[PDB]
Structure formats: structure tokens, C-alpha cells
Amino acid sequence: LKKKLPSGEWVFDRDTSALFLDGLQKGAVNGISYKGKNVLITGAGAGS
């Protein structure tokens, strides 16, 4: 993940990307549940 510096740019945040890469591990051995979500996706053509 990236954090917004006061300089205005987006550089690597180590604290939130630790949380994001934990959820990718928890969602890999267990799964991710989206029950209760209404999603609209466009451009979801075949082979994409």
C-alpha cells in the first residue's frame, strides 16, 4: 500500500501494507467472504 506524504506524493507505507499482506494470507488459507455485498462491475468480459 501507499501513504500520501505532506510533499503530495505516494510512497510505500510499511504499517498498512503489513495489514494488507496479512489479509492476503488469511484469505489464502481461509477464504474471503463477500456475503451481503452488492457489486457493480463493468468491463468484465470473457478472458479478462
UniProtKB/TrEMBL annotation:
Family: Belongs to the thiolase-like superfamily. Fungal fatty acid synthetase subunit alpha family.
Purpose of the protein: Fatty acid synthetase catalyzes the formation of long-chain fatty acids from acetyl-CoA, malonyl-CoA and NADPH. The alpha subunit contains domains for: acyl carrier protein, 3-oxoacyl-[acyl-carrier-protein] reductase, and 3-oxoacyl-[acyl-carrier-protein] synthase.
Protein name: Fatty acid synthase subunit alpha
Lineage: Eukaryota, Fungi, Dikarya, Ascomycota, Saccharomycotina
Residues of the full protein shown: 628 to 675 of 1879
